[PDB]
């Protein structure tokens, strides 16, 4: 396939309905070796599991919240690969109140602070710490939403994260970018599941898409999955600070 | 004037040579009420001193970084004010590392951490502390640089700040906008003026905006101000989340 | 005002329910004197007593389909001022089948060639022929809307022309700024009126902007005839290049 | 490959030393059955050879200026293949004075509508014919450049017709897109070759990039061919209405 010989690490695989494990599955059947991070104890035996469908053994735990674990598991990755190839960002998180109902009412500056450490500095600061290992034509992919360009109900502080979010994509390529490696981001549409505890219904914004999207339908995970392949790919080694939405072109409307 | 009646806070009037300066002179030229804050007891002089030339004697203390000083700020100012008509929002910091050279070598938890902080979090911080005495039709603005949107030389972790209050000023738009209040930002153009201690030198961009803008010059604190003071305005009634640039038309081209 | 002693030519008073009134009235009232354009002998009555309205007996006729009528344009104006300080370009056509159903089946080489002679090629073709009484601080502003940006159902061949003539704002503001000339658009968002013969329905999309607009209201001509004389006037002189929503804050959201 | 058993039409293969070669070279490394256009009797040769190095003896004349070779061309291919997967739009041409210095001197209404009618009406134009042979799952690709979204010296009358037509791949991809068909832009970046009789030099352009670009090099006929065959495969069944910029990331700094 066409990631043949590559080397990519993957955060955020919560789920096998998530995006994360749709890109593993589209990396793993272009050919990729794979690697894994979990973040506590209790979950190291489901990561495990996941892991274990695309061929790989390689967990590591990683809470980005720390920075003794983030400098530790590229420590642990090295042991096993000696130079990182890929890496797809999916961690995000924000409290409860931060991303229902009225921004301000969950607005708070522990809410906001956490919001942005854990959801847009977790990519820069993962970046870094891998940097000496990546290979020349290494490839960083993290995932936004369009919450990030335009308002969106309930979205909230995560649209101010993901906006710092998308500018480090930027930055970061600059940064990288001398020495050959590209950063991007695909900007997902939401994916036909229900949302998690805490996290406001999809049900509204699903059939919204359904119905305005160019290609009336919303996007899969398997779709979410190609396209995040690709950009990690040598495919794509002209693209880079690229913000690429993969949501059946439903950014492109006015519904 | 078209601000006749209109009662305006303003933050960060740090010099005569800045743009709250010459939004503070477009303001009370065209017939608004000025209060001012600051920073540190050290220079409550120098603020007494500027606010005075807008005939203004309000001012007052507020560190951002500070819930209880924000709060005491608009429980100050109410007890000259019984509504608010306007805020402007020029405050903005990141440790000298964080904005010169490279953006990894800057990147640290805490640096983010401050930056995000002072730079975009207290944007809504001041917006939630002043709404109760917020009156409908009040305009709230900040200001923002072109490194929000496309990565700058230097601007570095600035760049992801301002990305998150640009997004700010839409989150807030949604928030306030039921009762009338407008939130917008004007991305300026750099100043004709010479770098702080820390801040590296503006002479390259200076020269780059005047050799290529469409106007062939720099932007000025007036112009600026005038553009503020319209946001600022009822003439702006159908004007909300919008981020102006005022900057010779320099991000309109390819330089 | 703050328009004292400029004089500004206005395209497209066809009603005084449209945006160009608004911005005859705003001004007007800021100083201004002001000229206008006709289309065709049967309606120089008609527009006669709208300029009468606004204290002026100057109109001419122009049919921007035709070279001659755009040169004449400028020759009669001359003859009454010296200089022209401001443009209003509200001109805009598609032919009905082109603005009305599937975009395809509105798609001839003839409705393609109308609608971006008439809506795109009109505003430079003015810009062009009016250069050389053009005052060093003149300001030419076109109007625009959100379906240049992202797909509109039924806007079709129209966006792609005000797509057109937004790039023209770019390339007009380059070309004109050496002298010190702005160029801008408004986008404005829809107006609570009826929709002429031809052109579907507005119900939908007022109502939809009144319900999912940050202000949740709609734009009216007078906000977006005060933004469009902000953009005409010396307060606006760092803007140039500037595609300006003047629509409630539509357009950055996720209705 | 990734493109096994799909066919497509590539228009625009002028020389072995462009854009449209490296997608039809990547195409059909990845498996696709290819089919050429050519403009003029004296070129068929040419063409010939070309369409003879990818494996094909599939060559059609198409003058898009003429409506009856538009219609002729899809029904001449038909004879040949019952289904039509792809579509690569590489046309574009304006008179040499609308394209070269001040933008307002290359400005005459026949400029403009041959710039128009060549480079953005023709897009459309050709998805329309091609429509009813068209698969369900099929992909319609064209090339637009940066100097549809910013200002950039030369480009002039053709950042017209390119914003034209990058909002034509909006409203086709909704046109299409119930049916399950996609289209998008790639923004390409310049490509070091001597530019055409008539084109002002890209080595200041190129020069510009290099140095200025996050990867500091320039866009190859290989990357954007890559990145072409990406969005013409199932790989990008997410992806429609988008403008994907493979310029070495240029678009998303200021140099």
Same mark, same amino acid.
Request: contains cysteine; negative net charge; charged residues 20%.
């Given at each position: 396939?066409?990631?043949?010989?590559?080397?990519?690490?993957?955060?955020?695989?919560?789920?096998?309905?998530?995006?994360?494990?749709?890109?593993? $599955?589209?990396?793993?059947?272009?050919?990729?070796?794979?690697?894994?991070?979990?973040?506590?104890?209790?979950?190291?035996?489901?990561?495990?599991?996941?892991?274990?469908?695309?061929?790989?053994?390689?967990?590591?735990?990683?809470?980005? +919240?720390?920075?003794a674990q983030?400098?530790?598991?590229?420590?642990?990755? $090295?042991?096993?690969?000696?130079?990182?190839?890929?890496?797809?960002?999916?961690i995000?998180?924000?409290?409860?109140?931060?991303?229902?109902?009225?921004?301000?009412?969950?607005?708070?500056?522990?809410?906001?602070?956490?919001?942005?450490?854990?959801?847009?500095? =977790?990519?820069?600061?993962?970046?870094?710490?891998?940097?000496?290992?990546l290979?020349?034509?290494?490839?960083?992919?993290?995932? =936004?939403?369009?919450?990030?360009?335009?308002?969106?109900?309930?979205?909230?502080?995560?649209?101010?994260?993901?906006?710092?979010?998308?500018?480090?994509?930027?930055?970061?390529?600059?940064?990288?970018?001398? $020495?050959?490696?590209?950063?991007?981001?695909?900007?997902?549409?939401?994916?036909?599941?229900?949302?998690? =505890?805490?996290?406001? =219904?999809?049900?509204?914004?699903?059939?919204?898409?359904?119905?305005?999207?160019?290609?009336?339908?919303?996007?899969?995970?398997?779709?979410?999955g190609?396209?995040?392949?690709?950009?990690?790919?040598?495919?794509?080694? *002209?693209?880079? +600070?690229?913000?690429?939405?993969?949501?059946? *072109?439903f950014?492109?409307?006015? *519904?």
């Amino acid at each position: 396939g066409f990631l043949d010989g590559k080397r990519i690490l993957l955060t955020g695989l919560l789920s096998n309905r998530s995006i994360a494990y749709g890109i593993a $599955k589209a990396c793993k059947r272009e050919g990729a070796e794979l690697a894994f991070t979990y973040v506590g104890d209790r979950f190291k035996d489901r990561i495990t599991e996941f892991a274990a469908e695309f061929g790989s053994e390689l967990v590591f735990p990683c809470d980005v +919240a720390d920075d003794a674990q983030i400098d530790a598991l590229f420590a642990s990755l $090295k042991t096993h690969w000696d130079s990182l190839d890929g890496l797809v960002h999916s961690i995000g998180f924000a409290p409860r109140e931060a991303i229902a109902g009225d921004f301000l009412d969950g607005l708070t500056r522990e809410n906001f602070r956490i919001a942005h450490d854990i959801s847009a500095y =977790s990519f820069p600061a993962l970046a870094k710490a891998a940097l000496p290992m990546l290979s020349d034509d290494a490839s960083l992919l993290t995932l =936004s939403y369009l919450g990030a360009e335009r308002a969106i109900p309930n979205y909230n502080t995560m649209g101010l994260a993901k906006a710092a979010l998308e500018a480090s994509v930027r930055y970061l390529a600059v940064s990288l970018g001398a $020495k050959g490696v590209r950063v991007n981001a695909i900007s997902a549409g939401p994916i036909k599941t229900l949302a998690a =505890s805490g996290i406001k =219904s999809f049900g509204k914004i699903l059939d919204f898409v359904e119905s305005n999207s160019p290609l009336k339908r919303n996007v899969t995970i398997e779709q979410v999955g190609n396209a995040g392949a690709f950009l990690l790919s040598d495919l794509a080694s *002209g693209v880079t +600070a690229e913000v690429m939405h993969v949501d059946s *072109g439903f950014n492109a409307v006015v *519904g």
